[PDB]
Amino acid sequence: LKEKAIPKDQRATTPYMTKYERARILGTRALQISMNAPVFVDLEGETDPLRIAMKELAEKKIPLVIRRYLPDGSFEDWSVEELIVDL
C-alpha cells in the first residue's frame, strides 16, 4: 500500500521539532558533513561538523525530511525547513 503516505493538507503531528528529531538531524548532518558531504551554509571559519550542522540548522538549509510514522504505519513527511525549533 501507498495509502501509508498522509497528504500535506490533513497533518496532525507537532508543527514544532521533537528533542529527538533535533538530536538526530544534527547528528545525521554532522556525520554526513564529517564524511565530506556538500555544505549548504557559509561556514564562517567553522570546522567542527556538529557546529557546521548547527549552523546549517539555524539557517534552515538542511535538505533532510522527517518521515514521522504513526502506530498503524501511516506517516507524515515534515521538512527540517518547515519545522519550528523552539527547543
Partner: protein, 214 residues
C-alpha cells in the same frame, strides 16, 4: 419490629437501585419513581398484615425519546421480582414466554437466593431477546454511586466506529472491560459494545478513557 422490618427496608433499598439502573440504561423513569419513600413502598406492595409482596413489584419500562435517537432498535425492558427465595424452571418458563409473546427486547430477573440450573438453561434459549440474572442482595447498594466508580457511557455502533477511525485503532488495541464487570452488568453491556469512561484528573480537569467489552 423483629427482623421483617429490616428485610422490608433492604428490599426497598434494592428496589431504588433497579429503578436507578433502569433509568441510567436509557429508559423513562421519573425521579419521583426512584425517590419512592419506605412508608409509601409498604403501602403499595404489602399483604393482609404487612409483609413484602414481590409478585406485584414486577414492572415494564420504555425508552426515553433520547434513547431511540441513539439506539433506535433498543426496545422495551421488563423487570421481574419473585416471592420464592429459590426460583425453579416452572416459575422461570412463565417469564421466558412472557418476554417472547410481548416481543420484548430485554428482560431482567431479580432472584432472592438462587436460580436452579434447570431454569438457567432457558436464559439464552430465546434470542434476539436477552435475559439478565440479578441477585436481589447485590442490588441493595448502587455500586455506580461509589466515590471511586466513574461515569461509564455506552457507545452506539457509530460512536464506536468513529472512535476506532479517529484513533487508527483495531478493536484489540482498545483497553478492555470484562462482560462480568459490575458497571458492565449495570449498563447491560454486551460483547463488542464500547464504554466511554469520564473521570476527574489531577493533571487535566477531566480525562476520557474507553473500554471495549469481553
Amino acid at each position: 419490629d423483629q427482623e421483617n422490618e429490616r428485610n422490608i427496608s433492604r428490599l426497598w433499598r434494592a428496589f431504588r437501585t433497579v429503578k436507578e439502573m433502569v433509568k441510567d440504561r436509557g429508559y423513562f423513569i421519573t425521579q419521583e419513581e426512584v425517590e419512592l419513600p419506605l412508608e409509601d413502598f409498604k403501602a403499595k406492595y404489602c399483604d393482609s398484615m404487612g409483609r413484602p409482596q414481590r409478585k406485584m413489584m414486577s414492572f415494564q419500562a420504555n425508552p426515553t425519546e433520547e434513547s431511540i435517537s441513539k439506539f433506535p432498535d433498543m426496545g422495551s425492558l421488563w423487570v421481574e421480582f419473585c416471592d420464592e427465595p429459590s426460583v425453579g424452571v416452572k416459575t422461570m418458563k412463565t417469564f421466558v414466554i412472557h418476554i417472547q409473546e410481548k416481543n420484548f427486547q430485554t428482560g431482567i430477573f431479580v432472584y432472592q437466593n438462587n436460580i436452579t440450573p434447570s431454569a438457567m438453561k432457558l436464559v439464552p434459549s430465546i434470542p434476539p431477546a436477552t435475559i439478565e440474572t440479578f441477585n436481589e442482595a447485590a442490588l441493595v447498594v448502587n455500586i455506580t454511586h461509589h466515590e471511586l466508580v466513574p461515569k461509564h457511557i455506552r457507545l452506539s455502533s457509530d460512536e464506536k466506529r468513529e472512535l476506532l477511525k479517529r484513533y487508527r485503532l483495531k478493536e484489540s488495541q482498545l483497553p478492555r472491560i470484562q462482560r462480568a464487570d459490575p458497571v458492565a452488568l449495570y449498563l447491560g453491556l454486551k460483547r463488542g459494545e464500547v464504554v466511554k469512561i469520564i473521570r476527574k484528573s489531577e493533571t487535566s480537569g477531566r480525562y476520557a478513557s474507553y473500554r471495549i467489552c469481553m
